[PDB]
């Protein structure tokens, strides 16, 4: 029961720069008979299975670009991505195969691109007529192609601020331009949606000098 | 090429049973040791179990939280691996991968090959198909579809049958207070052509919604 530990939890590195991930085993993985470290690394892109990158601590799997490098010995190991590309954004796992079953992994380390600040483009969608005839109304606010991930969304109904009737989710970092997008949905009853008239989505972000509001009426 | 293709995932209630399959091609199935590895949403990888070659006696080994309820078997004649789950618990909810090493270099605990994974949702809640509502309409327009009130995950969304893929963002589903999921998908530019192909396989819902101004 070797426990695998990883550090850090998250990593943001500029494009072309070096990312360094660490992995610790609760006991040595080296095995003195040969001099081989029984340790592997896996890259898991969002929505994909893990892909094997390194094994025996430093043997690079076939087809893996040489910017990926592994090193370390015994209980301490490192995965280095020397010239970080946008496609390398993923969670990276280490795995021991020294004390056979079980196979055990580390907790992973997320690698993301560090990038110039990008202000979000903002769009607001009123509920469809397909939804209003069904007794609920969903107004969606889109925060598109911004960086970094931190953004605040505030809904206002008739210039009254809302709290606890919206929900949002964020895309993982875009594999090309390294930006994020965010989608917030405020959900009201058809009754309460019709009691009011103006619907505002207010957006705050590092890249905006003042907040951005997008609104409609009806 | 090596192919590990899995099927059989879906919704199942606590205490039920479900068999996942993994169909393999591109290597010697009979010389491979097969593993199942699972990943709860937003969590890490956890090894479920293993079966050796039949030449090695078809020995099976299982991880602690799963021994006594899960069973692994192999059919070398069909190149198909099975993961058979019983006495299911909600904490078994995860994406399940089949995975093996290349037998030609004798990789038995080095995981060269992975399937795409299949999601198993352990819940007493019941299946429901989604409602799909359009989202209409510098110098950029936004449009899309809203995929509301479905269970369980996942839904696969595509635009224009599908590709158109540029400027598209499909957002992670959100779990609403109701216990149903809602997600959205969006695209761009002032033009025109835009059909969202929504599909929720647990409920055989397959909708193509046309978004117009």
């Amino acid at each position: 029961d070797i426990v695998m530990t990883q550090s850090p939890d998250s990593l943001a590195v500029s494009l072309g720069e070096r990312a360094t991930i660490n992995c610790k085993s609760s006991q040595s993985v080296l095995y003195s008979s040969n001099n081989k470290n029984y340790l592997a690394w896996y890259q898991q892109k969002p929505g994909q299975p893990p892909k094997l990158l390194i094994y025996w601590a430093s043997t690079r799997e076939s087809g893996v670009p040489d910017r990926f490098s592994g090193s370390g010995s015994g209980t301490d190991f490192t995965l280095t991505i020397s010239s970080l590309q946008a496609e390398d954004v993923a969670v990276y796992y280490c795995q021991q195969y020294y004390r056979t079953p079980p196979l055990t992994f580390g907790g992973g380390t997320k690698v993301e691109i560090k990038r110039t600040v990008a202000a979000p483009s903002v769009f607001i969608f009123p509920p469809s007529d397909e939804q209003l005839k069904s007794g609920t109304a969903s107004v969606v606010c889109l925060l598109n192609n911004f960086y970094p991930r931190e953004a605040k969304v505030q809904w206002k109904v008739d210039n009254a601020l809302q709290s606890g009737n919206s929900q949002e989710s964020v895309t993982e970092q875009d594999s090309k331009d390294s930006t994020y997008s965010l989608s917030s949905t405020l959900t009201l009853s058809k009754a309460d949606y019709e009691k009011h008239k103006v619907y505002a989505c207010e957006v705050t972000h590092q890249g905006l000098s003042s907040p951005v509001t997008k609104s409609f009426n009806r | 090429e090596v192919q590990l293709v899995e099927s059989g995932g879906g919704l199942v209630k606590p205490g039920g049973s479900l068999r996942l399959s993994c169909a393999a091609s591109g290597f010697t199935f009979s010389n491979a040791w097969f593993n199942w590895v699972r990943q709860a949403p937003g969590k890490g990888l956890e090894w479920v179990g293993r079966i050796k070659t039949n030449t090695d006696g078809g020995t099976t080994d299982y991880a602690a939280p799963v021994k006594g309820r899960f069973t692994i078997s192999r059919d070398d004649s069909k190149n198909t691996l099975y993961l058979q789950m019983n006495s299911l618990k909600t904490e078994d909810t995860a994406v399940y991968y089949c995975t093996t090493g290349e037998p030609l270099v004798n990789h038995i605990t080095i995981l060269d090959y992975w399937g795409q994974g299949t999601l198993v949702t352990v819940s007493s809640a019941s299946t429901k198909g989604p409602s799909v509502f359009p989202l209409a309409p510098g110098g950029t327009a936004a449009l899309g579809c809203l995929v509301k009130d479905y269970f369980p995950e996942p839904v696969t969304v595509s635009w224009n049958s599908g590709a158109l893929t540029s400027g598209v963002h499909t957002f992670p589903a959100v779990l609403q207070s109701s216990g149903l999921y809602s997600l959205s998908s969006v695209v761009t530019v002032p033009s025109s052509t835009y059909i969202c192909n929504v599909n929720h396989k647990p409920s055989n819902t397959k909708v193509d919604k046309k978004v117009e101004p």
């Binding site: 095995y31 008979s33 040969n34 081989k36 029984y38 025996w56 195969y97 020294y98 004390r99 056979t100 079953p101 | 270099v105 004798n106 990789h107 038995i108 605990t109 080095i110």
Partner: peptide, 8 residues
């Protein structure tokens, strides 16, 4: 003991 993964 020795690890299961053989090394050629």
């Amino acid at each position: 003991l020795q690890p299961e993964q053989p090394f050629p």
